[PDB]
Design a protein around this nucleic acid. Structure first.
Lengths: 825, 81, 43
RNA sequence: ACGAGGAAUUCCUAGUAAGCGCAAGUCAUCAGCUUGCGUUGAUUACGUCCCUGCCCUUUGUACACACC
């Protein structure tokens, strides 16, 4: 059976990631879900949707929650985009040809923020781990990891090829550098978290947890360990919540010196830091009444060097912001807020004061937005689509243009459906308010207000589209008939308990009503004679569908299982469990029995209704899928989630002994080359100075591991075990015994490591010459007997030194014990 | 007394051992032995340090004892010619 | 005398004789020693 | 219809492989045989974990000495 693919995502304009801006109100890149969008904000529409070259739910794609975009940073000179995803992989993009050019990952959880090095050809990324990683842009390689924070970094700032400041989810400012390569300075910034830091060279402002920002002196001049970066003082905010981003804006000889702070609730405060001229003239003004109390009141500071003047204030909860300014007159500030809405502000100012109490929203991009959870969905006869949310703003879409055609506010809208020619939508709210709208003309046709005294929770048409059933929260299901332009209520039907989901048969046979009693009544529409009461869920059924020939309902609840029920007697075929949060909407393909279960786990599956396998499993959402609907004659399904995305799916090894042997002979070859080099340097310097040998080059293995040869053979002699050692250095021949003796010379001409491996060296050497004694004393080499003279003398000196220390300590400590007993036994 | 706690617990091995013996040598070479005795609780430390370093003395003494096979190989190689 | 457990719960003394204090060592070694004494009391 | 059985494969370590007979017919099995008993009686390993695997352990925890 053929499969389903993704077209794209539509209706997501501002996700959970920071925005950055491109100059020429300029271009603007934010993240949509798992792909990024490129805009102009004057025209107020998309110019390019950068997506990755892999369709989700495809025959190439994999089964997992797809990686959410969560940070943006643009470097506009070479035109690169660093994108970073919520699994922890960072890609970069040429923004022109739209192709990924580096795709590296080293992070485990989601990243937190990127930063380019200002065309340093290196990108530094900080995670929600304890990771700050430096990566090359021309390597596909990480320069280095950077790791001493406890929990999760929040902000950082680098400078040059040398220094960096960082701050984390525990309040610890850390200072790092390239060369010494570790942390150098640490402070507790706040008692809890610490979310944003910002610098222009001298000072460091940080935010805290609740309205305690803090001023710090940088000092990269000072060569004093404690105090590379000190603090001075604090001040407060208007908002009593965690400021989570600060940044500076500056200019030349106007002294732009403004920094902003994103509060965590609907608010962005802005501040000015002020020049030395007004600092100098105001210091004496505070130094009126004229020394100890003067310096105390001066330390009590940031009140003087700060200047809070404007607290811009949006419609609802903000999410991310970015700056632009020009020459002492205007400051313009992009803000993409929580739901898919961006809000580009501007303020005039007289470079001491704004001279306007409120900021100016010069632009607001609003078109493809939805502003709440889109909780209902429809699709007409393959000619237009629908989206419906608690905003009020129903949004009517088209297939191959994806533009918000019509938009008009109703209320807390949760269920809606077309009229059978299209062209008109009926809808219900959180009260008994039923709204009818058209496609093109004057929007609010009518509203039956107080159709019920409680909420309504589902509704459906008939097949011909004249009678209209709804099921409502007041234990009531009610009928309507359209009249030519309005509605007429005709038939109330009280129930024993509370309906929450209805559905009519597609060949208008009968209607199924759920209850919050864990059951569904199948109920005639001609006669209402209570055909069936089929049950067995134990938590209320909250989606109902009927087969295309009224033979087989598919019912589903918050018990995560869906039940496929034959209608000839209300019997079952399967009760099958999927989707481990809950189901909330199952939809039926209009020709065969293949149905689509959405979940509250960002997953839709379509299943055949006779063999019950999830013949396709589909993952491309991020949050709870709040509606879906399949097309009439397309096999063409729309689905809308809590992340404000709607989207449409369409048809298609040595051992011990010899290791010691070979490491020993390469080390001895290196050592003998070095001593021949010392003889050749004797020939160059301390001889008839005509020429020389140049250099025996370093051996590749010990140069790569950066080890002296005696330390390398000491490493392998260390790593062989105690048990097989006695035959490991019994395998080796007498020539290898001889170069082992040469190693013992060159290792006891180095008292650094001789004293730290002395019993090992002694046990090995004494067993070697005890086993090889018969050939050793028959060897005839005067340099060898001088060699073991040297070994005997220096080894016995080291042993008698350490046993001198041990005997001295024995006698001293037992003297101490015996004289304490002599004192008070 | 914290240093001698950690030094006694270093004294059990043979690898982390000589540096324990040398810091014992340091603190008893420098401090007053009367002060070392009248520090309270330290006799429980020092009587557990004593037999370990007695054992290590015997072990290194056997090492330097069997070191003389180099001298025997030397005197035989001198007997050679 | 023999080296036993640690005398306070801010450090660990191995039967080796070496000791780590529970804020000296890095988190990778904390995971490693957690796994190690998990096996050591699992047997 | 045949001149000692090919490709390869199976099995096998001391009174063992194998040759030679001879009895009996023991409630199931077997007489085309089965089981006993006697006789004659070797060659090659009797090591190794390298290959094929299979298993066990990774606190040594047992009470000195020693090693780890």
């Amino acid at each position: 059976y053929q499969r389903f693919e993704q077209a794209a995502a539509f209706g997501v304009i501002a996700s959970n990631a920071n925005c950055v801006w491109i100059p020429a109100p300029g271009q603007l890149i934010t993240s949509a879900l798992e792909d990024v969008n490129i805009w102009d904000i004057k025209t107020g529409d998309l110019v390019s949707k950068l997506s990755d070259g892999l369709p989700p739910g495809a025959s190439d794609a994999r089964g997992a929650k797809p990686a959410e975009c969560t940070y943006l940073e643009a470097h506009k000179d070479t035109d690169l985009l660093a994108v970073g995803y919520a699994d922890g992989v960072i890609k970069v993009w040429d923004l022109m040809s739209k192709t990924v050019l580096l795709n590296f990952n080293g992070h485990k959880a989601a990243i937190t923020l990127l930063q380019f090095d200002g065309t340093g050809t290196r990108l530094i990324s900080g995670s929600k781990d304890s990771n700050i990683i430096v990566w090359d842009l021309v390597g596909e390689v990480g320069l280095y990891k950077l790791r001493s924070h406890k929990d999760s970094i929040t902000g950082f700032w680098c400078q040059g090829e040398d220094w960096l400041i960082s701050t984390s989810k525990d309040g610890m400012i850390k200072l790092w550098d390239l060369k010494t390569h570790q942390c150098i300075e640490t402070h507790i910034a706040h008692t809890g978290e610490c979310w944003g830091l910002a610098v222009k060279d001298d000072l460091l402002i940080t935010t805290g947890t609740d309205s305690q920002v803090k001023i710090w002196k940088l000092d990269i001049e000072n060569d004093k360990m404690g105090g590379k970066l000190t603090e001075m003082g604090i001040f407060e905010k208007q908002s009593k919540q965690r400021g989570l981003k600060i940044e500076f804006i500056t200019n030349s000889s106007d002294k732009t010196s403004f920094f902003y702070i994103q509060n965590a609730d609907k608010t962005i405060e802005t501040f000015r830091i002020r020049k030395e001229e007004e600092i100098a003239r105001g210091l004496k003004k505070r130094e009126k009444r004229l020394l100890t109390e003067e310096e105390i009141a001066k330390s009590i500071y940031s009140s003087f060097i700060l200047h809070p003047f404007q607290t811009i204030r949006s419609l609802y909860k903000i999410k991310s912001a970015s700056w632009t300014t020009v020459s002492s007159s205007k400051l313009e500030l992009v803000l993409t807020t929580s739901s898919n809405t961006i809000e580009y502000y501007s303020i005039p100012y007289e470079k001491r004061d704004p001279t306007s109490p409120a900021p100016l929203k010069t632009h607001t991009i609003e078109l493809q937005g939805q502003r709440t959870d889109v909780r209902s969905i429809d699709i007409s006869d393959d000619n237009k689509l629908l989206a419906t949310a608690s905003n009020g703003s129903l949004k009517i879409w088209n297939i191959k243009t994806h533009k918000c055609i019509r938009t008009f506010e109703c209320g807390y809208a949760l269920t809606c459906k077309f009229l059978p020619g299209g062209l008109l939508v009926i809808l219900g709210t959180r009260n008994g308010e039923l709204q009818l709208f058209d496609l093109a003309s004057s929007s609010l046709l009518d509203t039956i207000e107080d159709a019920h005294d409680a909420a309504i929770w589902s509704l459906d048409l008939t097949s011909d589209g004249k009678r209209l059933v709804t099921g409502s929260a007041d234990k009531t299901v009610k009928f309507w008939d359209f009249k030519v332009l309005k509605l007429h209520h005709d038939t109330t039907l009280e129930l024993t308990d509370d309906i929450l989901c209805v559905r009519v048969s597609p060949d208008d046979r009968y209607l199924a009503i759920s209850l919050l009693d864990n059951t569904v009544k199948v109920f005639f529409l001609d006669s209402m004679k209570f055909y069936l009461s089929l049950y067995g869920h134990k938590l209320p059924v909250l989606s109902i569908d009927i087969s295309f020939d009224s033979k087989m309902i598919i019912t589903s609840s918050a018990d995560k299982n869906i039940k496929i029920w034959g209608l000839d007697f209300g019997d079952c075929h399967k009760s099958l469990f999927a989707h481990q949060d809950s189901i909330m909407n199952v939809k039926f393909l209009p020709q065969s029995h293949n149905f689509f279960s959405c979940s509250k786990d960002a997953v839709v599956k379509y299943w055949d209704g006779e063999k019950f396998e999830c013949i396709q499993k589909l993952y491309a959402h991020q949050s709870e899928v709040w509606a879906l609907a399949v097309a009439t004659d397309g096999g063409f399904v729309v689905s809308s989630s809590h992340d404000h995305s709607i989207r449409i799916w369409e048809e298609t090894s040595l051992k011990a002994g010899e290791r010691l042997m070979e490491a020993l002979d390469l080390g001895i070859a290196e050592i003998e080359g070095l001593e021949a080099y010392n003889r050749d340097m004797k020939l160059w310097q301390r001889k008839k100075l005509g020429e020389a040998p140049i250099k025996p080059q370093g051996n590749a293995v010990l140069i790569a591991v950066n080890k002296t040869p005696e330390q390398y053979i000491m490493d392998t002699l260390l790593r062989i075990r105690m048990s097989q050692l006695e035959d490991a250095l019994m395998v080796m021949p007498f020539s290898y015994v001889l170069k082992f003796l040469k190693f013992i010379d060159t290792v006891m001409q180095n008292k650094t490591l001789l004293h730290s491996h002395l019993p090992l060296i002694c046990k090995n050497l004494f067993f070697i010459i005890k086993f090889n004694h018969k050939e050793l004393v028959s060897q005839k080499n005067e340099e060898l007997k001088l060699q073991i003279n040297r070994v005997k003398t220096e080894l016995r000196s080291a042993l008698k030194s350490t046993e001198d220390d041990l005997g001295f300590n024995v006698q001293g400590l037992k003297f101490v014990k015996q004289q304490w007993n002599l004192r008070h036994n | 007394i914290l240093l001698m706690k950690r030094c006694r617990d270093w004294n059990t091995n043979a690898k982390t051992h000589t540096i324990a013996q040398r810091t014992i040598r340091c603190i008893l070479m420098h401090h007053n032995i009367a002060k070392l005795s009248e520090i309270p609780g330290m006799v429980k430390i020092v009587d557990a340090i004593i037999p370990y370093t007695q054992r290590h003395f015997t072990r290194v003494d056997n090492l330097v004892e069997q070191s003389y096979i180099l001298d025997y190989a030397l005197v035989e190689m001198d007997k050679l010619f | 005398y023999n080296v036993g457990k640690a005398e306070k719960d801010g450090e660990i003394r191995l039967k080796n004789g070496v000791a780590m204090s529970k804020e000296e060592l890095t988190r990778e070694d904390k995971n490693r020693l957690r796994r190690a004494l998990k096996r050591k009391r699992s047997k």
